[PDB]
Structure formats: C-alpha cells, structure tokens
Design a protein around this ligand. Structure first.
Ligand SMILES: CC(C)CCC[C@@H](C)[C@H]1CC[C@H]2[C@@H]3CC=C4C[C@@H](OC(=O)CCC(=O)O)CC[C@]4(C)[C@H]3CC[C@]12C
Ligand SMILES: CC(C)CCC[C@@H](C)[C@H]1CC[C@H]2[C@@H]3CC=C4C[C@@H](OC(=O)CCC(=O)O)CC[C@]4(C)[C@H]3CC[C@]12C
Ligand SMILES: CC(C)CCC[C@@H](C)[C@H]1CC[C@H]2[C@@H]3CC=C4C[C@@H](OC(=O)CCC(=O)O)CC[C@]4(C)[C@H]3CC[C@]12C
Ligand SMILES: CC(C)CCC[C@@H](C)[C@H]1CC[C@H]2[C@@H]3CC=C4C[C@@H](OC(=O)CCC(=O)O)CC[C@]4(C)[C@H]3CC[C@]12C
Ligand SMILES: CC(C)CCC[C@@H](C)[C@H]1CC[C@H]2[C@@H]3CC=C4C[C@@H](OC(=O)CCC(=O)O)CC[C@]4(C)[C@H]3CC[C@]12C
Ligand SMILES: CC(C)CCC[C@@H](C)[C@H]1CC[C@H]2[C@@H]3CC=C4C[C@@H](OC(=O)CCC(=O)O)CC[C@]4(C)[C@H]3CC[C@]12C
Lengths: 660, 134, 71, 49
C-alpha cells in the first residue's frame, strides 16, 4: 500500500479514506493506521461521537472484557446490549478508576451535549479518548502508538496503568484464565515502566519543568494532578523516584525552609513558643506571617498533633489506674472531650470528601482500615462513658470498656510511630507477618486442643456437663508454649494421696509429644517463614515507605491547625467564617502559555526517550551479532559472484591477449 | 583485638540499633498489656508511684521465661470475690504472650539474619582496618 | 627520606601508573563487547566496499566484452 | 578534568587519597546540607572512583 496504492495522483475519493481508517482501527492494524495517518487524515477530523460509538461497538479483534464490565455497571448502577453508549463505558472508567475521577463522558455537561444527538461531534484531544478505547479493549501496540502521538503523555501513562490494573483485578475477581490476568498485569507494568522512564528523562532534561509537569492540573483528565493519579494507581515506583520525593520534601517542610536537624528544631520551636524568630523561611506583618507560616506547615501539625496524642495517652492512663468517684475527674473531661472532638474530626473528614454521594464518601473512607477501627473505638468509648455515668453495677463494666479502649489507643500510637523511615518498615514487616501467624494459629489450635481434650479426659474421669471443661482444655497446654511446664501438675504422686485414675501414665507421654511438636517444630517453622518473608519485604522496604509518606503528607496538609483536644475551636470558625464571609495544595493552577511550555517539553522528552530506546537496541550486543551474521551472509553471496565472474574475466582476458 | 572475636564485637555494635527498634515496639505492646492489667484487676487505688512499678514488673518477666502462673486468673469468689471484669485478663494476656514472644522476636531473628548477611562481608576487612589504630 | 631515593620513588610511581593505564587500555580493547563493536563497524565498511567492487566489476565486464568485440 | 590532572604530575597516590577524603567530605557534608540527593550519591561515586 505504501509503494503502489499510495501513488502520486492515485485519485483518492471522499469519505472512503476515513471509512478505511475505521476499518483499519477495528481490525487492530497498527501500522496500517500509521500509514494512513502518514497520508494526513486529520485524526481530529475523524473522531465523531457516532464513529467513536461504533468504534466501541465492533465484535472484531481480540477478546473484549468490556461486555462483562458494562453488565456489572448496569447491575451495580441499579440482550446483546446493542449500541453500547459512551455514557456506559464512561461509567466503566468511573467504576474501574474509582476515587474521584468524574469523566467528561459521565459529566452532566457532555450529556446535555449528547441530548442534541440523543468540532461539532469532534473532541479537542482525540488521542486521549482513543488511548482509553485502546486500553479498555486489550489493544496494547495500539496504546503505545497512541501514546507516542498525542499530548499530556504522563497523564495518559498513569491512567492507562490504573485502568489496566483495575481490569486485572476485575478479571481476577471473575476467576478467568490466569493468561488474561497475566496480560493485564504485564500491560499495566509496561505502562508504569513507561511512566517512570518518561519521568526520569524529564528529570535529566530540566528539573523545574519536571516539577511543573508533575504538579499542573489536567482539565481533560478530570481536574487532577499526576501525583493523585499515581497514588490512585498504587504505582509505588513513580512515588519513589527522587523528583516526587523532593517535591514532597518541599511540601512537608511547607513554606518554612530551615532544615537542619528538623525534628529537634521544631520540637524546640513549638515548646518555648518564642523560638521561631531564629528560623528562616522561604522568601507586625513580618512576625504574624512567621507565626502563621510556622503554624501551617504539615510537619508542625504532625509533631504538635503527636504531642496531643501522647498527652492524651498519659492522661487516660492516669484515669484508668486511679480510683473513679461518681462524678468524673477533670482529666476525664479532657479525655472525653478529646474523643468527642476526634469523632467530630472524623465527621468533618467524611463530609469533606471529593466524591459527591455520601454513600461513596463513607465507602472510600471505610477502605482505610485505621479509620474504621477508630470508628469502633469512639463508639465503644462512648458506650463506656454512658455506662460510666450510670450507677452500680454498670460503673465496673464501664471501667472494663475503658480498659478495652486503652489497648486500642496504644495500638494507634504504633501507627503514629509508623513513620521514622527506619521504623516504618518494621511496621510493614509486622503487617506482613501477621498472616503467617494466622496459619500458625490454626495448626497450633488443632494440636493444642488435641492435648487439651486428652489431658482433661485422661485425668478427670467423672465430670458432669459444664463449660469449665473447655477452660481446662484451653488453659493448661497453652502456657507450656511460653515457658512454664506446670511441674507440680505433671506425674502427681499417687497410690502411696488419692489413687491413680485409669491410665494416667499416658498423659506424660502425650505431653512430651505436645511440647516436642510445639516448641521444636511449629514455632521454628514461624522462624523460617518469617525469615524468607523478611527477605521479600527488605527488597521493597524504603520504597514503600516513600509511597505511604505521600498519604501522610496530604493528611497533614488537609488537617486543621489545632490539636484534637481543642480542635472544636477551629471547627467553630469552620462553621462561622465559612458561613458568614461565604454564605452571605500541591495542585498548581497554571496559565495556557506555561501549559504549552510544559507540553512541548513533554514532546521533546518523549522523543528523547524513544531515540534512547532505539540507540540502546542498536548498540546492544544481540543486534550487533544478528546484523553482522546477516551481512556476512550477503558478503558470502557477493564473493561467490565476484570469484565466478572475475574468473570468467581471467579466461576472457587471457584468450584475448593470446589472440592479439 | 583478635581476628575472630573482634568481628563478633563489631556485629553486636551493628545489631544494637535493630535491638533498639525492637525495644520501642516491645514497650508499646508491653505497656498496652500493663495499662490493661493494673486497672481491670486493681480498680480501687489512690495515686501512688507504686502503680508505675506494677505497670512494668509483671509483663516484662513474662517475656524471658516465667509467666507467673499462680498470679493469673486467681480463684474467685469461693477467697475474695474478685474484680470488675477479671476473666478477660487471661485472654488479653494470651494475646500479649503470643504477639510478644512469637511475632516480634521471630522478626528480630529475621532482621539479625539479613544484617548478618550484610556485615559478614564487611567484617574481616574492617578488622584489617581497625588493626592500624591500635 | 632523602632526595635521590625520593626520585627513585617518583620514577616508580610514574612508571606504575603508566603500566596501569596501558593495562586497562589493553583490557578494554581485548574485552568482548569492543571486539563485537569493531567487528560490526568493519563488516559495515566491508559490505559497502564490496558492493562498489560489484558495480566496478560489471563495468569491467562490459569493458572487456567491448574490447573483445574490437579484437 | 581531575582524573586528567591525576594522570600528569607526580605523587599520584597521595593525590588519590586526598581526593577520596575530600569527595567523601563533600558527600556527607552535602547530605547534611540538604540539597538534591543526586549530588551526594555522585559525590560518593567520585570517592569510590
Ligand atoms: C471441635 C473443636 C473445633 C472444638 C471443641 C468442642 C468442644 C470443646 C465443645 C463442643 C460441644 C460442647 C458442649 C456443648 C454443650 C454443653 C452443655 C453445657 O450445659 C450448660 O451450659 C448448662 C445446661 C444447658 O443449658 O445445656 C455445658 C457445656 C457443654 C457440655 C459443652 C462442653 C464443650 C463442648 C464439648
Ligand atoms: C479461634 C480462637 C480464638 C479460638 C478461641 C475460642 C474458644 C477457645 C474460647 C472463646 C470463648 C471461651 C469461653 C468463654 C467463657 C467460658 C465460660 C467459663 O465458665 C464460666 O464462666 C462458668 C463456669 C465455671 O467456670 O465454673 C468456662 C470457659 C468458657 C466456656 C470459655 C472456653 C473457651 C472459649 C470457648
Ligand atoms: C526422645 C524424646 C522424643 C522423648 C524423651 C522423653 C521420654 C522418653 C520420657 C519423658 C517423660 C517420660 C514419662 C514420665 C512418666 C511416666 C509414667 C510412668 O508410670 C508410672 O509411674 C505409673 C504411675 C505411678 O507410679 O503411680 C510410666 C513411664 C512414663 C510414661 C514416662 C515414659 C518416658 C517419658 C515419656
Ligand atoms: C503514655 C506513656 C508513654 C507514658 C507513661 C504513662 C503513665 C505510666 C504515667 C503518666 C502520668 C503518670 C502519673 C503522673 C502523676 C502521678 C501522681 C503521683 O503522686 C504523688 O507523687 C503523690 C500523691 C498525690 O498527691 O497524687 C503518683 C504517680 C502518678 C499517678 C503517675 C503514675 C504514672 C503515670 C500515669
Ligand atoms: C520506657 C523505659 C525505656 C523507660 C524507663 C523509665 C521508667 C519505666 C522507670 C525508671 C525509674 C522507675 C521508677 C523508680 C522508682 C520508683 C519508686 C517506687 O515507689 C515505691 O515503691 C513507693 C513510693 C511510691 O509509691 O510513691 C515506685 C516505682 C517507681 C516510681 C519506678 C517506676 C518506673 C520508672 C519511672
Ligand atoms: C491458640 C489460641 C487459639 C489461643 C488459645 C488460648 C485461649 C483459647 C484460652 C487460654 C486461657 C483461657 C481463659 C482462661 C480463664 C478464663 C476465665 C473464665 O472465667 C470464669 O470461669 C469465671 C470466673 C468468675 O466468675 O469469677 C472464662 C474463660 C477464660 C476467659 C478462658 C478463655 C479461653 C482462654 C483465653
């Protein structure tokens, strides 16, 4: 086609070029697509709403998962499903992408555009939606092709990575072949690797424009920025590259730029509050700005919130140990105000979520485990309070419930100490090793309760039905794991003292077998399992640290200035100033010019990445061996013809010289 | 100074930092059990610093052997009628005994194993450095 | 140290660094991937010169046929 | 440029050791000076070379 069909003056008709374009797209013909775009068929002129609708509505090419996806969206929102609408597949990105990506498709604005037909029907960035079409319908070399031709390539890489990973989790949810889950997983890893490679290429070219690239708003990609898309992707390596970490360092320090043993300097900054005059910041009024800057960094909110937490735990320890008179102490009022304002903080956070529907808000909040366990914590502490302010005997049960909360707030201090960067990984190790302990608990359960029913049933011969038997089953074997073997209870002197019962000589041997298989086998299996699981988790280690840091960064920017014990004050201003002046973060709002600067920076960087891949491929040893092998073959044939033809030269030349 | 025990000394000096992180997580679990224990069983005592000793004495020696089997679920009301909800004390103790003597310690085995992978390749040559000093 | 022994030491030092740089250049030239590269480049040149010998071969063949025509 | 100067002249060993100490000095001191991590990494690389 490129040599003869595409001839000089081959009289090209009207409309059939775009029809052949459509026919080339729907059969997955990537290099025919390159050929016909090389002719110059404006791809912006091509994408009509109708052509896009029938572009998704074609049963050709590879396997299409979008069938089962649109049926799941049709089920969860409330035939061959003819004319699969762009609205429904927009909802498919709403489901798979999740979070707060409200698509242009699923936005009400473009539905009121769509009611006209329920530039005129032509997108201003066609390659965007085209990539989305290619990624959803398995077509990956198509996706690379449309990644090279287009604008906002980083955002495309991240949305393709998340969409592909989401289809991977969806396909693993329906228990299909591991081939399809494997190819979705591999394809998403390929897009993520492109995202990392383009990021580091942009880092090597120009650094400030790399930050501006990783911070601007994406009006086409549902008004968000690259870090939000990347943390939605859970693409750990992209929030591990030094660019994003340097940005989050700048965000974490905030508008202050002191940075010399930062934690010690800030804990001397807040205590003895006139100490921040000697700390430098980024360039009456120049003191009020300093105190406001030093009260709105994320790091100061972190440390001063952590001081609030440790002060809380000290005061609640002082409550739970000391006697409780009938009306609660002043320290207890500080405690119950902390819990009440912490509940109001969780309620403020559940109202201030970017999903619009409240069910979506509570769903995405219940995705995070610590927050829901905080909810059961606040609920049980308020139950303990309402039992505590009554009379006997519910006062004692209130003390029980207060103790039950004391364990959990100690567990939350492990979370607030889950930073450090040298102790954060230790927290992740525990997190991973608990699952292996569950299997240990199952096997230890069956062997332990075997010994328990044995030792009760041998020794105690005539007992009536009572629940205390189960306590004997689960009491005596269990502590022999952890030391004490109950030396007095084992082989009691008998028959010299009450007589021996039945064959009570067997239970020493059963105990020998139990302590053998318990203290020598299973615990040391948990040694071995914990050793190799540490071997995987050390491979990631500080990497996943950087990932979880981002979440912490955002929360400590979005949290109010005050600690929880008095945060009700700032909640008052949230219901006063924002209801009087109004009722009566990393996101960089950017101009169009700088936007075009970031754009042609992207094009230069992606073309540099592609030439670097081709130059690596050409200079790799494998390609050199292959091309020299082929060229020695070509030379061998040319030497054949040289030897034959110029031997005929010698024969003719000698015969001609003989004649003359 | 000797080329065999000197590396072991260096190994200890490397392992102490990992031990310190182990100690911090061990304090958070042990104090959780201590705040539980000295309150559910003892619901009627005045402010005294003696409580501070009790919040650290009883849980800490449970790690290293003896689990104090006589002082756990004492025979109730048959003898004083015992405390508020004192039956939960063996269950939360069982949780503490398990997490503490299994999970964190076994993780510290794994930590020590990987750091001993790292510092053995160092060890002989760093003795060959420290030799110069003496 | 005395100055003549220092001069011997300095001669030793410049000698040893010279043999080191000679040895690393000979390591780099005898390493596999450089042999691969230089062979690839050489065979590139071989093939283009051989195709030129082909064109010039046909030119000589036509010349000799024309010379045999005139003899 | 520094390795070229290390080629020329005399007392190359002393030069190499001093340059190694200085390179590690800029590496760790720049780690406390809190610039980009790229330099402290490459400074460590320079001291290793
Ligand atoms: C098989 C593994 C996983 C667990 C081991 C189970 C046993 C230890 C359980 C299961 C059935 C239980 C019995 C079910 C019913 C009763 C009646 C129960 O009687 C009462 O509580 C008072 C009278 C009544 O109301 O029934 C006393 C405990 C007992 C014997 C239970 C004792 C403990 C048993 C044997
Ligand atoms: C998966 C793991 C966590 C298994 C753990 C569950 C069981 C081993 C535990 C959970 C609740 C326990 C029960 C909680 C309370 C009692 C009542 C207790 O009896 C009394 O309080 C009155 C009778 C008496 O002891 O005189 C006897 C032990 C028993 C049955 C316990 C036996 C062991 C049980 C069934
Ligand atoms: C090598 C490993 C796998 C096991 C090593 C330990 C066993 C060889 C020992 C440990 C405890 C011993 C038991 C301790 C007590 C008794 C009770 C004894 O019976 C009596 O003394 C009768 C009762 C009475 O005298 O009043 C018979 C031997 C036996 C089962 C012993 C058999 C041998 C045992 C199991
Ligand atoms: C949250 C963790 C990491 C820190 C440790 C918490 C508790 C073990 C501490 C914090 C505050 C301490 C209390 C602070 C003050 C006092 C008063 C003190 O009383 C006296 O010295 C004289 C008696 C009096 O008049 O009260 C007795 C110890 C006690 C209850 C302390 C007991 C131990 C407490 C509860
Ligand atoms: C968390 C770890 C790494 C820090 C270790 C510090 C505390 C756990 C220790 C250090 C000194 C100990 C104190 C040393 C002496 C006493 C006096 C002692 O007082 C009595 O025996 C009678 C007097 C009274 O009860 O007031 C009570 C325990 C107490 C407060 C100890 C409680 C626990 C303390 C504060
Ligand atoms: C391997 C895993 C599954 C853990 C196995 C151990 C637990 C299932 C056992 C060990 C100790 C047991 C406890 C030992 C003592 C008691 C007190 C007992 O309380 C009474 O009998 C009431 C006495 C009173 O009324 O004063 C109720 C069962 C309970 C909580 C037991 C419940 C089951 C426990 C936690």
């Amino acid at each position: 086609a490129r040599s003869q069909i595409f001839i000089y003056g081959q009289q090209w008709p009207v409309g059939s070029l775009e029809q052949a374009m459509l026919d080339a797209l729907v059969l997955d013909r990537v290099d025919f697509v390159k050929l016909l775009i090389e002719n110059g068929v404006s791809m912006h002129r091509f994408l009509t709403i109708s052509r896009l609708e029938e572009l998704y509505n074609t049963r050709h090419g590879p396997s299409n998962t979008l069938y089962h996806l649109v049926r799941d969206v049709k089920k969860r929102e409330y035939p061959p499903d003819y004319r699969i609408s762009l609205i429904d597949i927009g909802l498919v990105i709403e489901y798979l992408m999740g979070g707060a990506y409200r698509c242009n498709y699923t936005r009400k604005r473009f539905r009121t555009l769509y009611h006209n037909l329920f530039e005129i029907n032509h997108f201003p960035f066609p390659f965007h939606e085209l990539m989305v079409w290619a990624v959803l319908m398995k077509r990956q070399k198509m996706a690379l092709f449309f990644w090279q031709h287009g604008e906002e390539a980083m955002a495309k890489a991240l949305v393709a990575c998340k969409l592909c990973k989401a289809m991977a989790h969806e396909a693993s949810e329906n228990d299909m072949v591991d081939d399809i889950s494997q190819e979705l997983n591999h394809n998403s890893r390929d897009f993520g690797q492109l995202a990392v490679e383009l990021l580091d290429q942009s880092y090597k070219q120009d650094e400030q424009l790399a930050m501006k690239l990783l911070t601007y708003e994406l009006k086409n990609w549902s008004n968000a920025t690259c870090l939000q898309l990347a943390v939605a992707a859970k693409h750990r390596d992209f929030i591990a590259h030094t660019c994003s970490q340097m940005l989050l360092t700048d965000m974490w320090m905030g508008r202050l730029r002191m940075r010399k043993n930062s934690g010690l300097k800030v804990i001397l900054g807040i205590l003895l509050p006139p100490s921040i005059l000697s700390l430098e910041f980024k360039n009456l009024i120049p003191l009020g700005r300093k105190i406001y800057e030093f009260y709105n960094a994320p790091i100061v909110k972190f440390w001063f919130y952590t001081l609030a937490y440790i002060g809380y735990l000290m005061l609640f320890n002082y409550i739970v140990l000391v006697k409780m008179e009938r009306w609660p102490s002043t320290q207890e009022w500080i405690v119950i105000s902390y819990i009440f304002t912490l509940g109001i903080e969780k309620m403020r956070e559940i109202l201030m979520s970017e999903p619009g529907k409240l069910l979506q808000k509570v769903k995405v909040w219940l995705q995070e485990y610590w927050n829901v366990t905080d909810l059961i914590a606040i609920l049980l502490f308020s139950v303990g309070m309402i039992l505590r302010l009554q009379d006997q005997p519910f006062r004692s049960d209130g003390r029980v419930i207060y103790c039950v909360n004391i364990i959990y707030w100690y567990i939350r201090l492990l979370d607030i100490f889950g930073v450090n960067k040298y102790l954060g990984p230790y927290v992740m190790m525990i997190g991973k090793m608990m699952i292996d302990m569950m299997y240990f608990v199952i096997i230890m359960l069956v062997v332990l309760m075997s010994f328990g029913v044995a030792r009760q049933a041998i020794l105690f011969p005539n007992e009536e039905p009572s629940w205390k038997l189960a306590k004997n089953i689960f009491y005596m074997p269990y502590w022999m794991i952890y030391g004490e073997v109950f030396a007095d209870q084992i082989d009691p002197p008998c028959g010299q003292l009450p007589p021996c019962k039945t064959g009570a000589w067997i239970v020493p041997a059963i105990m020998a077998c139990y302590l053998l298989v318990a203290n020598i086998l299973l615990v040391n299996l948990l040694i071995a399992v914990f050793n190799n699981t540490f071997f995987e988790v050390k491979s990631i280690s500080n990497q996943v640290w950087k990932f979880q840091r981002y979440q912490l960064i955002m929360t400590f920017h979005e949290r109010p200035v005050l600690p929880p014990p008095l945060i009700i004050f700032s909640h008052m201003t949230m219901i006063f100033q924002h209801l009087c002046c109004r009722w009566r973060g990393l996101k960089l709002f950017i101009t169009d010019d700088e936007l075009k600067k970031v754009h042609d920076f992207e094009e230069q960087c992606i073309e540099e990445y592609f030439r670097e891949k081709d130059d690596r491929f050409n200079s790799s040893n494998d390609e050199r061996i292959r091309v020299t092998s082929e060229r020695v073959e070509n030379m061998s044939m040319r030497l054949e013809e040289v030897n034959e033809r110029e031997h005929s030269m010698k024969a003719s030349l000698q015969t001609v010289d003989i004649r003359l």
